[model samples]
Target chain A: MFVPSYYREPHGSWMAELIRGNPLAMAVINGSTDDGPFATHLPIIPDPRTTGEWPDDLTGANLLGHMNRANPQWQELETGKVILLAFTGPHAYVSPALYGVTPAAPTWNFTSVHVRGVVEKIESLEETLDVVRATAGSFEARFGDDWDPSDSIDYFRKIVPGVGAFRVTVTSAHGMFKLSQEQPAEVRDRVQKSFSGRGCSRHRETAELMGRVPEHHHH
Target chain B: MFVPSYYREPHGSWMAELIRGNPLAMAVINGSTDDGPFATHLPIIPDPRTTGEWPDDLTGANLLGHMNRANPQWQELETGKVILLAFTGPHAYVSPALYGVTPAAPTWNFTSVHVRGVVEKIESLEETLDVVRATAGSFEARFGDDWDPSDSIDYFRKIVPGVGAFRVTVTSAHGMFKLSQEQPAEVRDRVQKSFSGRGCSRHRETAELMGRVPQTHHH
Candidate 1:
């Protein structure tokens, strides 16, 4: 992801919110086994670090997540290996015809954050279970429902080893919101109108965030 | 990307068609110098090849496309390194609220194809111009107005060198269509209906394809 300086934010408050809003991600790591490189889709969390463990250089950010034990990606988690965690957000189709330009091309509108980090697998089942509980709690927080550990302790224990729970310590992060930002304001507005008229809710949200208000009254 | 056998396809004819439909793709390649991995979004075309050139092995299949010289991704091609091509198609937002199930999770409906392959850059400016013309033709064929090289040869030459063209002689190819395929047909049909009701043209197309419709409706 070649994010230019303007697109790359130093503070990246938006990036954090983007990750929280879109929790599931595709984790990729360089392969040590003969099978080749490994990539898996899993839920991720950005660990809270008051000390700002994220490098000021923007190249040293880290992420935390776990993969299923049935997935062999964790087996190669040696020290100092580069891992990629990609969190993708709402993406919608862009019709060339809607662009209102001759020779206009169709494209996809999407937002994503890719974290290149180091892997640290939790060897202890107990610690892995704790990670799972914390993740579940975080995932359920927005929904207003709290998960009781006691209710699923037995099930958690049974599935602990089968589902490998691990954490990713980020070293570098790349975030992008490719939502017609470079296009003209009127072009962006037209896109939003098309998206809303067609009921493309995800893209409508993106268009709103990009500063285009949909014609519909609904937020 | 490690794809299970169930998700792997040999020739990927349907997958190729899907890729062709996706005009824009993010192609990532490890840079030649110490510039780190380079990635870019570019218009591409499927390099034509014979059946004999395609390997019988699942991992041996590949694809071909080109990038502009203005993009840094093309700088590393002369060194004979592999590039990772990611083609993503029609994706939809799946609201848990719509699922009407407790503990239901929100997920995105998407289809994508990833190809890791070796490259052969088209060094001649004339050949690169040819690729651009072919690409324009391939895309416009759906509308019956193929590109004419002679019509714009002078204008295209100014941008030809900035463009880099290569083919992926794939070492590995992976395809995934997470379009409610695992759900029961009844549930899938309901989901398709919801997609249609929502007016998500792209997602409706995905559902129709995954549902294996006898006649595909195009918008």
Candidate 2:
């Protein structure tokens, strides 16, 4: 994916933070068979078992994700296959009016992270179940109630047979922080306020990040 | 994307509605050059010049989207390049506890529409400007104020030069509405309620769809 030089990194930690906050990603694998390109919208997380903050570049980071085994995509998936995982973070349409500059044009300011990784499929059901728990544990710690998943081990095993758990070892990663960073500081400030005042979560969350796009940098 | 049998279409109008409501889609093109896979998160809309409620199958639907002309992906894009546009709708993690049944396991209930289409790049600047206005006008009609963009034509003409406008003529489309349809109604009702009570818009929007899965159909 080509990110224009002007829309590059807003912050060192932005990519990792965005991935952590928005873990559900569209995982894409190149088509080799008659089925062609394969993609899945599924929950993915930095392996819950680890504690290291994602290296800014995200290389060597081990991530966990699972899709239904029934998906033909899973059937076609193989270890060592290269895959692309795209994570959508806060995004919103920036009205041309917000620019307050003469002859202003409309643009959508958005942020996304794309990681190209090598796939590692788990064959053992027991290990698949482990991936399942780690997945739950990861999200539950953040967005869930204090309900422990240990109580559901029996249920997990029953369903683990159908889980296509896979690991993505990040070979390389990049982020596009198209948060109007190329605009003048005063123009960008108005854009942030317009989004900050909006009711939509996309706008508010995007506004929060727009504020984080350091003012020191420019094309 | 492999959607289980039980997680298929929840309604005839679902795919079109979901795409309209969540128009920002991840456009994926197969990697053939050294870059391999390419994706861009951009605003996509039904050609604003014409208004037709999308047919259930979405064949021949014309969608307009654009990227920066400077982006390499746009440089590599060729007419008739088959692309995958994945629209992510409401999605949330369904806790095992939401099931309210024995041996309950966790699952994420999500709604998404994936369409495969042939690309048609617009080389004319006037046609590209029309697309830009339609995109902003479409969203403004739904979410923005009653501001006319006509005064900004000169402005748009100045900036549209850098826009890489393209149209996708859909070949085939499928939607995966994985909204608690696999569960017993009593349990699904509980799941919906759990999400409805949450503060997050993802949960609230997801709950709205969960209510639409026709209870009459079952595996």
Candidate 3:
């Protein structure tokens, strides 16, 4: 993620909130000596003890997720190999038509957090099941306790054999909030307003993010 | 990009439409022999003559995009090294609660096309500007003719030096349509209904894609 200084997002609360809002990570692995790189589109739950409870300490947090054992991509996740997890939030195309300047070019406005870390695979069956339970517990909050993995251990165990769970111990985190932050304040304001009124959901989300920009620095 | 036989999308019309709908590619490159891998979230427009006009002949298509010359990731796009361009479409979390069975688990429904190819850097300044103009031309259509890059050749030339343009002559294209295609018809229908009823923009998009499934296959 090549985020220029102006587009770089603050590492603490802002990036943490973005990750929590969009938990699914595009996990990529730099392949070992013989193999090429591989990636998986999977959901990675931020552990409650770290990211959930203490949003400011994102670097201390570990991401939890599982991949099918049968997936050849899993082979690329050998211990100590650095993995990059990209969490993408709302993204929309910002047209220069929204700006007042002739030299202005079209750009994409987006919020993303890239986490680089080494994988620590959960080896034991019990630990893998725990990962599944924790993942379920986090996402299932929308449905209440109506669908808890603990409701049936046998069913959980049956499915546990085919998956591999792991935690990504964070080494470096990069956040890119490319919301026309470098643009003139007037241009940014117009773009934000137009995005909000565009009737598209992503555009509205991008508008909300742009609104988060601090006013004093813009002028 | 692992696509089981059932989840594998047809090569021609399906993939062409997916690429057209989601032109932005999260381009990834394997690191140099001594370095780690790198990635860029950039827009890659499919060539109009190859991909747009003939959806069935995707193999002849080339993806055009540019990256900041200041970014070190561009160095990784050296010749002969395979680069992966991931184009992710709408994705949503499907709760197993929508299924009739208690033992059912939640899954994500998504559509993505992965293009693997070697990058060929556009050397001449004229060609690089052309790439920029082409990219701007493609994305600017949404804004109508209000903002055309060709309107100001000098301004486009000034920015062209700061970027490196390249073409990914696609070697292999893979599509994964993981939309509960393995689930029973009742489960798939219910999930589609739930996604459509949800107010989230992504859910609605997912619902629309789900409806694209062949009727005979669903029943």
CAPRI band of model 1?
A: incorrect
**What order do candidates take by lDDT, descending?**
2, 3, 1
lDDT of 3 by residue, A1-219 (tens): 687888888546777777767777788877643335788887788665565442655675777888887788787677767788888889888788788677656777878888887788878998888778777667777432355554456777887888778888777778889888878789889999998887768889989989988611111
lDDT of 2 by residue, B9-125 (tens): 666568878888878888888775334477888779887543554556878888999877866779767897788889988888777666767666666777889988888999998
What ranking of all candidate models by DockQ puts the best one first? 2, 3, 1
Q: Compose the digit string of candidate 2's lDDT tens values, residues A6-33.
A: 6777655778888888888888987752
Angstrom error of the Cα, residue B92, model 1: value is 7.0
Best by lDDT: 2
Which scores greater on DockQ, model 1 or model 2? 2
List the candidate 3 regions with Cα displacement exceeding 4 Å.
A32-35, A48-54, A142-146, A150-152, A215-219, B32-35, B49-57, B143-145, B215-219
Per-residue lDDT of B1-219 in model 3, one digit per residue for the tens? 777766677445777678767777788886643234688888788765564455354664677888888788887677666788888888887666787666667667888888877778877899888787878878888443367665566877766777788888777788888888778788788888888877777888888877777642210
CAPRI tier for the interface of model 3: acceptable
Model 3: share of true interface contacts reproduced? 0.29
Give DockQ per model, in order. Answer: 0.14, 0.42, 0.41
For all the candidates, what are their Cα RMSDs to the real structure? Answer: 7.3, 3.0, 3.4
